Enzyme design. Structure first.
Site, PDB file in Angstrom:
ATOM      1  N   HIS A 189       0.807  -1.212   0.000  1.00  0.00           N
ATOM      2  CA  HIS A 189       0.000   0.000   0.000  1.00  0.00           C
ATOM      3  C   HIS A 189       0.843   1.265   0.000  1.00  0.00           C
ATOM      4  CE1 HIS A 189       0.246  -0.528   4.514  1.00  0.00           C
ATOM      5  NE2 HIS A 189       0.412   0.781   4.448  1.00  0.00           N
ATOM      6  N   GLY A 227       3.481   5.871   9.557  1.00  0.00           N
ATOM      7  CA  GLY A 227       4.807   5.867   8.973  1.00  0.00           C
ATOM      8  C   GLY A 227       5.678   4.691   9.378  1.00  0.00           C
ATOM      9  N   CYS A 240       4.912   1.590   8.940  1.00  0.00           N
ATOM     10  CA  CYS A 240       4.663   0.456   8.070  1.00  0.00           C
ATOM     11  C   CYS A 240       5.914   0.103   7.277  1.00  0.00           C
ATOM     12  CB  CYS A 240       3.489   0.763   7.140  1.00  0.00           C
ATOM     13  SG  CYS A 240       1.855   0.299   7.836  1.00  0.00           S
TER      14      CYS A 240
HETATM   15  C1  LIG Z   1       1.706   1.533   9.150  1.00  0.00           C
HETATM   16  C2  LIG Z   1       1.749   2.947   8.532  1.00  0.00           C
HETATM   17  O1  LIG Z   1       2.780   3.458   8.303  1.00  0.00           O
HETATM   18  N1  LIG Z   1       0.464   3.543   8.215  1.00  0.00           N
HETATM   19  C3  LIG Z   1       0.318   4.843   7.578  1.00  0.00           C
HETATM   20  C4  LIG Z   1      -0.633   5.750   8.003  1.00  0.00           C
HETATM   21  C5  LIG Z   1      -0.732   6.970   7.352  1.00  0.00           C
HETATM   22  C6  LIG Z   1       0.106   7.274   6.284  1.00  0.00           C
HETATM   23  N2  LIG Z   1      -0.066   8.560   5.616  1.00  0.00           N
HETATM   24  C7  LIG Z   1       0.767   9.718   5.984  1.00  0.00           C
HETATM   25  O2  LIG Z   1       0.628  10.774   5.468  1.00  0.00           O
HETATM   26  C8  LIG Z   1       1.881   9.633   7.033  1.00  0.00           C
HETATM   27  C9  LIG Z   1       3.172   9.144   6.789  1.00  0.00           C
HETATM   28  C10 LIG Z   1       3.864   9.276   8.038  1.00  0.00           C
HETATM   29  C11 LIG Z   1       2.923   9.842   8.904  1.00  0.00           C
HETATM   30  O3  LIG Z   1       1.797  10.033   8.272  1.00  0.00           O
HETATM   31  C12 LIG Z   1      -1.142   8.628   4.607  1.00  0.00           C
HETATM   32  C13 LIG Z   1      -0.850   9.601   3.461  1.00  0.00           C
HETATM   33  O4  LIG Z   1       0.212   9.647   2.927  1.00  0.00           O
HETATM   34  N3  LIG Z   1      -1.925  10.484   3.043  1.00  0.00           N
HETATM   35  C14 LIG Z   1      -3.179  10.360   3.761  1.00  0.00           C
HETATM   36  C15 LIG Z   1      -4.056  11.601   3.597  1.00  0.00           C
HETATM   37  C16 LIG Z   1      -5.113  11.809   4.475  1.00  0.00           C
HETATM   38  C17 LIG Z   1      -5.922  12.928   4.338  1.00  0.00           C
HETATM   39  C18 LIG Z   1      -5.670  13.835   3.319  1.00  0.00           C
HETATM   40  C19 LIG Z   1      -4.616  13.626   2.441  1.00  0.00           C
HETATM   41  C20 LIG Z   1      -3.807  12.507   2.576  1.00  0.00           C
HETATM   42  C21 LIG Z   1      -1.461   7.272   3.946  1.00  0.00           C
HETATM   43  C22 LIG Z   1      -0.894   6.961   2.716  1.00  0.00           C
HETATM   44  C23 LIG Z   1      -1.185   5.743   2.121  1.00  0.00           C
HETATM   45  C24 LIG Z   1      -2.042   4.882   2.779  1.00  0.00           C
HETATM   46  N4  LIG Z   1      -2.583   5.196   3.942  1.00  0.00           N
HETATM   47  C25 LIG Z   1      -2.326   6.353   4.527  1.00  0.00           C
HETATM   48  C26 LIG Z   1       1.041   6.353   5.849  1.00  0.00           C
HETATM   49  C27 LIG Z   1       1.139   5.142   6.495  1.00  0.00           C
END
Ligand SMILES: *CC(=O)Nc1ccc(N(C(=O)c2ccco2)[C@@H](C(=O)NCc2ccccc2)c2cccnc2)cc1
Ligand SMILES: *CC(=O)Nc1ccc(N(C(=O)c2ccco2)[C@@H](C(=O)NCc2ccccc2)c2cccnc2)cc1
Lengths: 305, 305
Positions: free
Chosen positions: B41, B143, B145
């Site tokens: 993902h 982050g 993950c």
């Molecule tokens: C396990 C893990 O790492 N989960 C995770 C949660 C959330 C994100 N996302 C982040 O931005 C992030 C990376 C580090 C801290 O936060 C989101 C993302 O990139 N965009 C989400 C968003 C929400 C609302 C409006 C715009 C964008 C993300 C990306 C991909 C999948 N899920 C969540 C990364 C990882």
């Protein structure tokens, strides 16, 4: 998002661990730049430990009597010096894996990671606290001496502990990296009183804040209290007195949760007077005191290095 | 000599951690030989996670859309492939710090160390267990993950876990390094039942043996019991059933302490029926189940790597 007793990544320290052999005893040493640090009783036999004269014992030792091995690499010893309770061995090669580092003497209540080693090889890593009585409740077997404790700030390893002895009570004592023992202990196999330990109040409070952040909030009442009234309770239950310095360092956690420190104190008072009623807080049935306010902030913010 | 929840030294894994960016999402990846492994993902936006079609989303991605950074080093992506729930990125450079390694799918009840990372940089290390319900009770923020779980055997790192999701209940789910989830979980932001968890009986027994080895023996009675009678109690208290396979793996601990496994079972029965009477066992007020019999042997023998 969960809360765990978390140690620092141990890589930068792993590359500094060496084995030190003096005639017959083999301990761990710490190789930084062109100097290896290790416990001075590497020069003792068994009988020596009962009442050693370290100055006389070291006088019988020359550079070539010390064998230092970094895994398979040989370090040639070209100088030696006793500093307090540590022996420094100058070697002819600077450790290529020397990280940025400082030597730090920590305060009771502060925490650090221990890299337990045997024969110069790392065995495991765990987090612990310097008790108020300057002992640590480690996991150390014979041969673990010279294992070090440390904190990491971004790129900088701050060494704060080197392991030297196990007290007959099963708790552990050692030095800073200048060789000065924490607490009243001496490197001699004699019975030694550690003294009354206490619970680290500011750390318990920090951990209660971590609990709230992570969803565990059943212990929140809406009593409050005063510093002086709380400290009366702290004294009854062998808790360290809380100071305005402690209240201040809890400020950021108070700000994040919107829970005033004196309000959390009232919750702690009720937990001390009534126990936990068979419930748990962050997976524990006891009040945990080996997380500092900084430890909570770091684990709850995702700080990397 | 003390007993601690001890993680493996994290150095060999630290040198494999990279940051993976796909357009906008940034996750952790694991760089081994000339392949980087990370959660699939990494290719999703926020909205995608609600119901992602991973095959369609990856079809829009080319090699050059993936940016992989090992600290400051650039890896040029020259191939990509989805394997179950992991994405594999072939890079043009073999990781020079690749340790000896295997990929292992562990069984529930087994333990491993987690190296929590953010943006490819290690944050901390801790030990945990795969629950019977195939969740883990980790410490993972957004982050994290792509962080991995592992065991170390001498020189060989056995990767068993890659982190993929946090369930609404605050517990954690992920895959083996072939991308197959542990348990029924899917990489989708939908509510998912983890199912009844149970306590890992063989691990509790191992930890009771560790306690005796280290001096804590107040819980030894001299009742004994039978496997079938004990399992009646285990079922009442949501403990995993004990089998002769479990009795056998406890053999070495039984041999060291001279305490027959069925005798330790009777002690566990009394602890389950009567609690701990406000006492503690190895610094805990609960029955701890995240030490395997192997974990006890290793920590009590001083096994290095
Ligand atoms: C396990 C893990 O790492 N989960 C995770 C949660 C959330 C994100 N996302 C982040 O931005 C992030 C990376 C580090 C801290 O936060 C989101 C993302 O990139 N965009 C989400 C968003 C929400 C609302 C409006 C715009 C964008 C993300 C990306 C991909 C999948 N899920 C969540 C990364 C990882
Ligand atoms: C903290 C630490 O490492 N303490 C420690 C305890 C015991 C030893 N010794 C060992 O042999 C050893 C090394 C690894 C496991 O065990 C002894 C020692 O070398 N000889 C003791 C002895 C006893 C009886 C008869 C002959 C010899 C030792 C050496 C020096 C000082 N104290 C103890 C090392 C370290």
């Amino acid at each position: 998002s969960g809360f765990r007793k978390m140690a620092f990544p141990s890589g930068k320290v792993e590359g500094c661990m060496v084995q030190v052999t003096c005639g017959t005893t083999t301990l761990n040493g710490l190789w930084l730049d062109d100097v290896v640090y290790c416990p001075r009783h590497v020069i003792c036999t068994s009988e020596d430990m009962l009442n050693p004269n370290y100055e006389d014992l070291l006088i019988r030792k020359s550079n070539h009597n010390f064998l230092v091995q970094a895994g398979n690499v040989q370090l040639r010893v070209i100088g030696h010096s006793m500093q307090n309770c540590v022996l420094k061995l100058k070697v002819d090669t600077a450790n290529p894996k020397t990280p940025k580092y400082k030597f730090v003497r920590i305060q009771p209540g502060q925490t650090f990671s221990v890299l337990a080693c045997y024969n110069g090889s790392p065995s495991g890593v765990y987090q612990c606290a310097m008790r108020p009585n300057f002992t640590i409740k480690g996991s150390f077997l014979n041969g673990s001496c010279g294992s070090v404790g440390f904190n990491i700030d971004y790129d900088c390893v701050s060494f704060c502990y080197m392991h030297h002895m196990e007290l007959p009570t099963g708790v552990h004592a050692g030095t800073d990296l200048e060789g000065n023992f924490y607490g009243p202990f001496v490197d001699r196999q004699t019975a030694q009183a550690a003294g009354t330990d206490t619970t680290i109040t500011v750390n318990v409070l920090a951990w209660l804040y971590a609990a709230v952040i992570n969803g565990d909030r059943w212990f929140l009442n809406r009593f409050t209290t005063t510093l002086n009234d709380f400290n009366l309770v702290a004294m009854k239950y062998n808790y360290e007195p809380l100071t305005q310095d402690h209240v201040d360092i809890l400020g950021p956690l108070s700000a994040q949760t919107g829970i005033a420190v004196l309000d959390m104190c009232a919750s702690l008072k009720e937990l001390l007077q009534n126990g936990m009623n068979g419930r748990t807080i962050l997976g524990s049935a006891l009040l945990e005191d080996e997380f500092t306010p900084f430890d909570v902030v770091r684990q709850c913010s995702g700080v990397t290095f």
